[PDB]
Design a protein around this ligand. Structure first.
Ligand SMILES: Cn1ncnc1[C@H]1c2n[nH]c(=O)c3cc(F)cc(c23)N[C@@H]1c1ccc(F)cc1
Length: 356
């Protein structure tokens, strides 16, 4: 042409850092190490969906054996089959026999994380690996998600920072949160998928935290419901998509540590409709007619008189008050939907966790 075209990224610097953080191979590897996976038998590139599906089904059979009665033989078999799919490093300490709810639930949570890691990794290795363009921009494109920095002095940013400041507490005072960057995101196709559900009333802007190593999968594919193969163990309100109205609650699901103290949390617009309100666990197959979601009532709720609207989207950013709620085990509210299309992701926050 007339111009020299640099091989540098065409993205702004905070977006570049976001892409590097979510495609960080070192983090993928650390996760594998923490799970004690044998990395020579099962390297990052060897993880597959079919493998993960089959391992979930095994865990469901373990769960059925725990609730409905087991033999030693059966349990040993299921453990052997699980570890054949997800090989364990014998250089490390003996792996747990899968014969109890905690182990089942820890392994299911491993599989959720590994699935998103596999997604990230396959996106990363796929494509034209030619230098026709910057690696950062190529990996950005693969997310099929528009990501823009929200200007810090814009209305949106002031509202968002307020939602964070107010709904962060002195209870989970392990850390305070600091907003580093606010991104506006739009996943390809999601607005169209969401449209019909926009018709329902009670649309709310709610938090959803997750591990950083899951975000490539989250952005490329959107928030998902655990598959049918996955065990039900540990799903307080069954297999759906869970959100909080207090940033403190969602931030726990970032599983950030003093070692890596930055996490990512979403704000999504969720079409709740009529809410089935509950005070304790209850695994949900069907929902009562008239209801389109569940709300788990907590001891603490954002002050409803300090609530705001956006596009006719309720933003419950009031400071946390005692809900007055009688006989509940939940510290905080939760909201669950059972159809992936009831969610429209709007923002992604990068936060600093300042531990004490
Ligand atoms: C599995 N899952 N799917 C969507 N969200 C989630 C988790 C969770 N993710 N992110 C959140 O912010 C969150 C906010 C809550 F108030 C409550 C939540 C969550 N419970 C969820 C939970 C449930 C079962 C489980 F074995 C692990 C974690």
């Amino acid at each position: 042409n007339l111009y020299f075209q640099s091989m540098k990224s065409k993205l702004p610097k905070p977006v570049q850092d976001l892409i590097k953080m979510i495609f960080d191979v070192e983090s993928m590897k650390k996760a594998m190490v923490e799970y004690e996976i044998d990395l020579q038998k099962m390297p990052l590139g060897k993880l597959s969906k079919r493998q993960i599906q089959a391992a979930y089904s095994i865990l469901s059979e373990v769960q059925q054996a725990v609730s409905q009665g087991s033999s030693d033989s059966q349990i040993l078999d299921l453990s052997n089959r699980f570890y054949t799919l997800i090989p364990h490093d014998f250089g490390m300490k003996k792996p747990p026999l899968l014969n109890n709810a905690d182990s089942v639930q820890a392994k299911a949570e491993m599989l959720d994380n590994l699935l998103d890691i596999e997604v990230a990794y396959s996106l990363l290795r796929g494509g034209s690996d030619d230098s026709s363009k910057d690696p950062i921009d190529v990996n950005y494109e693969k997310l099929k998600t528009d990501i823009k920095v929200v200007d810090r002095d814009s209305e949106e940013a002031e509202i968002i920072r307020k939602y964070v400041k107010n709904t962060h507490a002195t209870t989970h005072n392990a850390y305070d949160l600091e907003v580093i960057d606010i991104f506006k995101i739009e996943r390809e196709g999601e607005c169209q998928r969401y449209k019909p559900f926009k018709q329902l009333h009670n649309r709310r802007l709610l938090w959803h935290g997750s591990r950083t190593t899951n975000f490539a999968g989250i952005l490329s594919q959107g928030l998902r419901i655990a598959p049918p193969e996955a065990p039900v163990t540990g799903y307080m309100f069954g297999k759906g998509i869970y959100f909080a109205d207090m940033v403190s609650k969602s931030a726990n699901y970032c599983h950030t540590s003093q070692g890596d103290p930055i996490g990512l949390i979403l704000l999504g617009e969720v079409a709740l409709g009529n809410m089935y309100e509950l005070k304790h666990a209850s695994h949900i197959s069907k929902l009562p007619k008239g209801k389109h979601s569940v709300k788990g009532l907590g001891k603490t709720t954002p002050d409803p008189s300090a609530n705001i609207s956006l596009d006719g989207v309720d933003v419950p950013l009031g400071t946390g008050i005692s809900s007055g709620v009688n006989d509940t085990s939940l510290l905080y509210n939760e909201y669950i939907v059972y159809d992936i299309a009831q969610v429209n992701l709007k923002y992604l926050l990068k936060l600093k966790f300042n531990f004490k």
